[PDB]
Amino acid sequence: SVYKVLLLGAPGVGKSALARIFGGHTYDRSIVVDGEEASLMVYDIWECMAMGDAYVIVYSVTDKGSFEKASELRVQLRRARDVPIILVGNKSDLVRSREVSVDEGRACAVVFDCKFIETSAALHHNVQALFEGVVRQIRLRR
Ligand SMILES: Nc1nc2c(ncn2[C@@H]2O[C@H](COP(=O)(O)OP(=O)(O)NP(=O)(O)O)[C@@H](O)[C@H]2O)c(=O)[nH]1
Helix, strand or coil: CEEEEEEECCCCCCHHHHHHHHCCCEEEEECCECCECCEEEEECCCCCCCCCCEEEEEEECCCHHHHHHHHHHHHHHHHHCCCCEEEEEECCCCCCCCCCCHHHHHHHHCCCCCEEEECEHHHCECHHHHHHHHHHHHHHCC
């Protein structure tokens, strides 16, 4: 039961940051979601066919570019290849230089069939939740 999770997105959004947090390259760690264990391997790929159990697409809420690159990715993913996709708006802490609102993320995931969450790698906020929902989401689509 080793779920393989791919970390995708535009440059500088905070991918390597999210991987590192979650697993103290490729990142290993087992977690408990709903009474049930779970062994995630997280691939910070921008640091192989495509053998992914889930995709996390990260954008920064301070970078509209990264955000619209994310939709573009989401559509690509869907045309090419099923596997669950999680849409992540990282950097929720930079309240000031924010370019994408929460609602824009949610009301764009829902329509393009992603799980949405905002994280802040800098404040270890929702990084836990993110990788928990990744596990849950792989289970929702057996
Ligand atoms: N304030 C804040 N800064 C963040 C957050 N996450 C990442 N950063 C910062 O943004 C920069 C890019 O982080 P990084 O994780 O390297 O992004 P990346 O997506 O891996 N870049 P690359 O694709 O080049 O590997 C770093 O300076 C990092 O500290 C966050 O949640 N909040």
